[PDB]
């Protein structure tokens, strides 16, 4: 209304960006407060009305965005409430709007509406995917009728996302922190994505399909939450098993399974090396053992108990292939295995192999 | 020599990039007329004046001009970097000179010969040594610009210098048994 | 006495490989009475090191990252084994540890203590699992220094909600105001 | 808070409403500032983020340059040109009042 | 041998298992480590003339065999610590062994897909250059560096230029 009427006072009074600012300051006094919903809304539809967005009215919006004037959030919500029924280039105009803004989302200030900001970013992601779907339908009906010209241009708009902060606990983690109150919106990211499953694989554009699958995996990287060339070997698992053999043999399998999972997680031990170290520690404790009544302890440990631990570990995770790789590592240690054969008086790995095979 | 150089100084004391291209035009004439052997004291006095200005913005745009002077090949990289990180004015106390200096060395160090990278790494490590083991919570982030130049020299994907030279200098300045 | 005279040995090693091997082994030499070892290590030794101004020189980078890893591993293993009942000693000592983390992060002086505390935070983020949901036992007046680990970030975003007490009403606001900066 | 900056902030002109940055901890030696122009005559522009070298006075308060602020539009880029030039001219002893006054003159001269 | 030619995926970090000082105090030795151990004592106690057989042994009967990366690392671990002995008495065998080392790197590059441990290899080569050989192997190594994969040339650039 009256606030809308000022935009009319600039309908074709191409006053300017700056004189627009000063006019707004005069007309609606900023004494108490503003930007509740005023500027973004009052500007949007009076710009996008009809086929082409009014270049000057859109220009003042570009301005108010650039000068940190409106919200950085109410703008997102205003674009979110846009209803792609405009099959024309106007969507490209709103993309040009999002251009300079989306890469940097300060929202610093009162900052309580920052949860509002992630709410808005979620609604804007919904709007982005909806525009993607409309532009893909245009792609399809154009493959029927007209060669595409600007259909995939909103893919670069999604590439405006996919940066950390754009999808970090700004978007992702606060996406779920927001579904705590807007679970319907988590179902919304799932739901738009369901129809995305329909409208994705049909397209015949290879590079664009690959980028779209990348964005779709980064959406599937909303569950998001190193050191591949682990060189030095893993000595803590060695010492953990060795301690569980020396001090506390009768301790329940569950306790040792708990301790061993923890260490694997904390230190990111590849599962082939885990079992290698367990079996190496058992043998070393057996070889360097007292003569008479402690040797039975190491052998009972090595041959009966560690197998049940590895069974419980299999339960707590291709583990067969994994223990196979571990045993392949182990067999390629002739000194330790031959000392074991010497001390135990029998082939200490033939037996261990048959015993490990007897379990799962 | 000294007179026209002092005159350029009074000018830079007396559209910003346009003023800077004017200063580069002023530099190019003196350089085309500068001797080939007195380059070193020339740059020494240049940077000496650069560090005199106590204004972060003034040293900022003077450093930007120096970056153009070294980027457009008018100025040799080795001499300018050695002079920058070889001065008596460069002290960790004046945090702004430090931050801007090492942000400049980061940019212009790409391109020094490998011998010069050795010498520069030696002198930069010697410079970080002067920094004590307790600094104000504010300076830390700016002081850490030295970590940037050290990291760029060391990173093997940059291959600025023979890695073995880097380890040789680092070990000479940090023998076995000293953190 | 045990934890003190073993960490004093860890802190004298100058080479990276040896300090890492040292902490890997100390974690298992410590599994003997892991709970009490955690209590004493965290409570009496890490504050003693972080509040001396002369033990600060020992927390330098080759031995300090190792001690940080060991502390995070100890904290996770003591909690993961068998509102939150602040009568449990482990909970009280964890609360005190993170309070000191806060005071050190937001203090006028910066030095190796700040780097060690940042390293402890980084490691607690790295090996963060489902057990220690809220950066395990970040106290309620905490998450107020998530802002400080942002201002002194030296660390990627999205690790801070991993820090942050997610799935909470006030958690929403704190995490949002936080990531707004980084 | 250095309590000299407190004075200069107290005695300013009303149009230059200045608060301290929510980001950072102003506690340590230098307090950051987030000052946002007002004044009915002017055109609202982007805020100017200040930083005071607590050794100040005799220490110029830094400015934080960013095209992320001004790139879009002509009025903003003109503002930036005028601002950087006039600030470069400002002599060697800047006080926060000098920065903010210069900024006001820059906005005004860009309104031309 | 299977331990280094084909079944290289099962021996772990090469620089680890090719040490027998460690990898023994923890019973993780292999036969290759033993042989490299007895080949450092035999060569430590040998005279200069007896080691003069090492340069020939490197080219006539070792250069054709070595193809994989671990084989190259093994040959380096053997003949490396004795450049210090070759240099002081017999200055030519050092030149021959350097020419052999670079040639072996060419072979290992011209037969494998990715030289996984490029950094330690290039490190040892630069160490050789700067400490023992100096500027007396340029002509023979120029041709060899010219024909390496671009990643290796990028690092070994400073050897000659």
mmCIF file of C-alpha atoms in Angstrom, chain B residues 15-177:
data_model
loop_
_atom_site.group_PDB
_atom_site.id
_atom_site.type_symbol
_atom_site.label_atom_id
_atom_site.label_comp_id
_atom_site.label_asym_id
_atom_site.label_seq_id
_atom_site.Cartn_x
_atom_site.Cartn_y
_atom_site.Cartn_z
ATOM 1 C CA UNK B 15 41.606 7.069 -8.379
ATOM 2 C CA UNK B 16 44.069 5.473 -5.965
ATOM 3 C CA UNK B 17 45.424 3.025 -8.550
ATOM 4 C CA UNK B 18 45.724 5.991 -10.907
ATOM 5 C CA UNK B 19 47.997 7.757 -8.419
ATOM 6 C CA UNK B 20 49.874 4.466 -8.160
ATOM 7 C CA UNK B 21 50.355 4.140 -11.921
ATOM 8 C CA UNK B 22 51.660 7.703 -11.816
ATOM 9 C CA UNK B 23 54.121 6.628 -9.117
ATOM 10 C CA UNK B 24 55.127 3.638 -11.248
ATOM 11 C CA UNK B 25 55.746 5.967 -14.178
ATOM 12 C CA UNK B 26 57.883 8.086 -11.866
ATOM 13 C CA UNK B 27 59.769 4.974 -10.756
ATOM 14 C CA UNK B 28 60.413 3.727 -14.290
ATOM 15 C CA UNK B 29 62.222 6.905 -15.347
ATOM 16 C CA UNK B 30 64.603 6.899 -12.375
ATOM 17 C CA UNK B 31 65.162 3.172 -12.884
ATOM 18 C CA UNK B 32 65.998 3.528 -16.573
ATOM 19 C CA UNK B 33 68.371 6.219 -15.344
ATOM 20 C CA UNK B 34 69.447 4.335 -12.215
ATOM 21 C CA UNK B 35 72.935 2.870 -12.012
ATOM 22 C CA UNK B 36 73.340 -0.901 -12.323
ATOM 23 C CA UNK B 37 75.635 -1.362 -9.307
ATOM 24 C CA UNK B 38 74.010 0.882 -6.682
ATOM 25 C CA UNK B 39 70.705 -1.014 -6.801
ATOM 26 C CA UNK B 40 71.198 -2.417 -3.311
ATOM 27 C CA UNK B 41 71.433 0.831 -1.354
ATOM 28 C CA UNK B 42 68.685 2.180 -3.593
ATOM 29 C CA UNK B 43 66.277 -0.507 -2.404
ATOM 30 C CA UNK B 44 67.612 -0.210 1.137
ATOM 31 C CA UNK B 45 66.670 3.457 1.266
ATOM 32 C CA UNK B 46 63.409 2.654 -0.528
ATOM 33 C CA UNK B 47 62.267 0.192 2.129
ATOM 34 C CA UNK B 48 63.737 2.408 4.864
ATOM 35 C CA UNK B 49 61.306 5.106 3.796
ATOM 36 C CA UNK B 50 58.541 2.520 3.448
ATOM 37 C CA UNK B 51 58.868 1.516 7.098
ATOM 38 C CA UNK B 52 59.063 5.117 8.280
ATOM 39 C CA UNK B 53 55.403 5.829 7.595
ATOM 40 C CA UNK B 54 53.501 4.898 10.752
ATOM 41 C CA UNK B 55 50.185 4.658 8.900
ATOM 42 C CA UNK B 56 48.945 1.139 8.088
ATOM 43 C CA UNK B 57 47.146 2.448 5.021
ATOM 44 C CA UNK B 58 50.161 4.347 3.758
ATOM 45 C CA UNK B 59 52.512 1.398 4.127
ATOM 46 C CA UNK B 60 49.712 -0.691 2.661
ATOM 47 C CA UNK B 61 49.536 1.184 -0.622
ATOM 48 C CA UNK B 62 53.295 1.691 -0.761
ATOM 49 C CA UNK B 63 53.608 -2.087 -0.466
ATOM 50 C CA UNK B 64 51.031 -2.471 -3.216
ATOM 51 C CA UNK B 65 53.161 -0.208 -5.396
ATOM 52 C CA UNK B 66 56.240 -2.272 -4.561
ATOM 53 C CA UNK B 67 54.287 -5.378 -5.544
ATOM 54 C CA UNK B 68 53.670 -3.853 -8.957
ATOM 55 C CA UNK B 69 57.309 -2.801 -9.216
ATOM 56 C CA UNK B 70 58.461 -6.367 -8.576
ATOM 57 C CA UNK B 71 55.667 -8.068 -10.513
ATOM 58 C CA UNK B 72 56.178 -6.074 -13.723
ATOM 59 C CA UNK B 73 59.838 -7.040 -13.656
ATOM 60 C CA UNK B 74 61.178 -3.540 -13.106
ATOM 61 C CA UNK B 75 62.591 -4.690 -9.767
ATOM 62 C CA UNK B 76 64.576 -7.851 -9.065
ATOM 63 C CA UNK B 77 62.842 -10.249 -6.672
ATOM 64 C CA UNK B 78 65.951 -11.314 -4.769
ATOM 65 C CA UNK B 79 67.062 -7.798 -3.888
ATOM 66 C CA UNK B 80 63.629 -6.562 -2.862
ATOM 67 C CA UNK B 81 62.790 -9.543 -0.667
ATOM 68 C CA UNK B 82 66.209 -9.664 0.993
ATOM 69 C CA UNK B 83 65.953 -5.954 1.720
ATOM 70 C CA UNK B 84 62.415 -6.265 3.068
ATOM 71 C CA UNK B 85 63.258 -9.057 5.505
ATOM 72 C CA UNK B 86 66.804 -7.783 6.139
ATOM 73 C CA UNK B 87 66.054 -4.362 7.650
ATOM 74 C CA UNK B 88 66.689 -2.883 11.066
ATOM 75 C CA UNK B 89 63.168 -1.469 11.220
ATOM 76 C CA UNK B 90 61.525 -4.887 10.973
ATOM 77 C CA UNK B 91 60.754 -5.796 14.568
ATOM 78 C CA UNK B 92 58.021 -8.077 15.851
ATOM 79 C CA UNK B 93 56.870 -5.264 18.138
ATOM 80 C CA UNK B 94 55.438 -3.188 15.278
ATOM 81 C CA UNK B 95 52.846 -5.767 14.339
ATOM 82 C CA UNK B 96 51.483 -4.019 11.265
ATOM 83 C CA UNK B 97 54.808 -3.722 9.464
ATOM 84 C CA UNK B 98 55.332 -7.415 10.189
ATOM 85 C CA UNK B 99 51.955 -8.501 8.846
ATOM 86 C CA UNK B 100 52.206 -6.438 5.676
ATOM 87 C CA UNK B 101 55.858 -7.337 5.092
ATOM 88 C CA UNK B 102 55.232 -11.047 5.161
ATOM 89 C CA UNK B 103 52.055 -10.754 3.125
ATOM 90 C CA UNK B 104 54.299 -9.104 0.539
ATOM 91 C CA UNK B 105 57.083 -11.686 0.786
ATOM 92 C CA UNK B 106 54.473 -14.395 0.350
ATOM 93 C CA UNK B 107 53.455 -12.884 -2.978
ATOM 94 C CA UNK B 108 56.856 -12.000 -4.413
ATOM 95 C CA UNK B 109 58.867 -14.972 -3.115
ATOM 96 C CA UNK B 110 57.547 -17.134 -5.914
ATOM 97 C CA UNK B 111 60.279 -16.623 -8.477
ATOM 98 C CA UNK B 112 63.515 -16.170 -6.529
ATOM 99 C CA UNK B 113 66.327 -18.512 -7.511
ATOM 100 C CA UNK B 114 66.756 -21.535 -5.281
ATOM 101 C CA UNK B 115 69.908 -20.129 -3.686
ATOM 102 C CA UNK B 116 67.994 -17.006 -2.772
ATOM 103 C CA UNK B 117 65.181 -19.073 -1.326
ATOM 104 C CA UNK B 118 67.749 -20.721 0.938
ATOM 105 C CA UNK B 119 69.091 -17.359 2.073
ATOM 106 C CA UNK B 120 65.571 -16.017 2.594
ATOM 107 C CA UNK B 121 64.485 -19.047 4.588
ATOM 108 C CA UNK B 122 67.567 -18.695 6.753
ATOM 109 C CA UNK B 123 66.857 -15.048 7.473
ATOM 110 C CA UNK B 124 63.115 -15.540 8.024
ATOM 111 C CA UNK B 125 63.730 -18.343 10.505
ATOM 112 C CA UNK B 126 66.271 -16.130 12.234
ATOM 113 C CA UNK B 127 63.621 -13.410 12.361
ATOM 114 C CA UNK B 128 60.940 -15.603 13.924
ATOM 115 C CA UNK B 129 63.495 -16.638 16.540
ATOM 116 C CA UNK B 130 63.489 -13.132 18.001
ATOM 117 C CA UNK B 131 59.765 -13.415 18.797
ATOM 118 C CA UNK B 132 59.529 -14.387 22.471
ATOM 119 C CA UNK B 133 57.489 -17.202 23.992
ATOM 120 C CA UNK B 134 54.665 -14.905 25.120
ATOM 121 C CA UNK B 135 52.768 -12.429 22.944
ATOM 122 C CA UNK B 136 49.558 -10.487 23.366
ATOM 123 C CA UNK B 137 46.379 -12.241 22.314
ATOM 124 C CA UNK B 138 45.874 -9.678 19.567
ATOM 125 C CA UNK B 139 49.203 -9.801 17.737
ATOM 126 C CA UNK B 140 49.245 -13.593 17.361
ATOM 127 C CA UNK B 141 47.121 -13.754 14.234
ATOM 128 C CA UNK B 142 49.083 -11.042 12.443
ATOM 129 C CA UNK B 143 52.476 -12.326 13.573
ATOM 130 C CA UNK B 144 51.485 -15.699 12.138
ATOM 131 C CA UNK B 145 52.075 -14.327 8.660
ATOM 132 C CA UNK B 146 55.612 -15.668 9.013
ATOM 133 C CA UNK B 147 54.171 -19.155 9.234
ATOM 134 C CA UNK B 148 52.644 -18.447 5.837
ATOM 135 C CA UNK B 149 55.929 -17.732 4.078
ATOM 136 C CA UNK B 150 57.645 -20.632 5.825
ATOM 137 C CA UNK B 151 54.828 -22.944 4.772
ATOM 138 C CA UNK B 152 54.979 -21.806 1.167
ATOM 139 C CA UNK B 153 58.732 -22.338 1.044
ATOM 140 C CA UNK B 154 58.480 -25.774 2.623
ATOM 141 C CA UNK B 155 55.479 -27.244 0.778
ATOM 142 C CA UNK B 156 56.937 -29.746 -1.665
ATOM 143 C CA UNK B 157 54.168 -29.057 -4.168
ATOM 144 C CA UNK B 158 55.599 -25.550 -4.438
ATOM 145 C CA UNK B 159 59.108 -26.945 -5.125
ATOM 146 C CA UNK B 160 60.539 -23.457 -4.733
ATOM 147 C CA UNK B 161 63.872 -24.841 -3.531
ATOM 148 C CA UNK B 162 65.626 -28.178 -3.098
ATOM 149 C CA UNK B 163 63.921 -29.713 -0.078
ATOM 150 C CA UNK B 164 67.290 -30.903 1.182
ATOM 151 C CA UNK B 165 68.499 -27.310 1.371
ATOM 152 C CA UNK B 166 65.465 -26.443 3.462
ATOM 153 C CA UNK B 167 66.158 -29.228 5.923
ATOM 154 C CA UNK B 168 69.836 -28.271 6.018
ATOM 155 C CA UNK B 169 69.095 -24.693 7.046
ATOM 156 C CA UNK B 170 66.343 -25.704 9.456
ATOM 157 C CA UNK B 171 68.661 -28.164 11.187
ATOM 158 C CA UNK B 172 71.533 -25.696 11.380
ATOM 159 C CA UNK B 173 69.142 -23.338 13.136
ATOM 160 C CA UNK B 174 67.477 -26.116 15.175
ATOM 161 C CA UNK B 175 70.031 -28.812 15.971
ATOM 162 C CA UNK B 176 69.133 -32.286 17.192
ATOM 163 C CA UNK B 177 67.690 -31.947 20.679
#
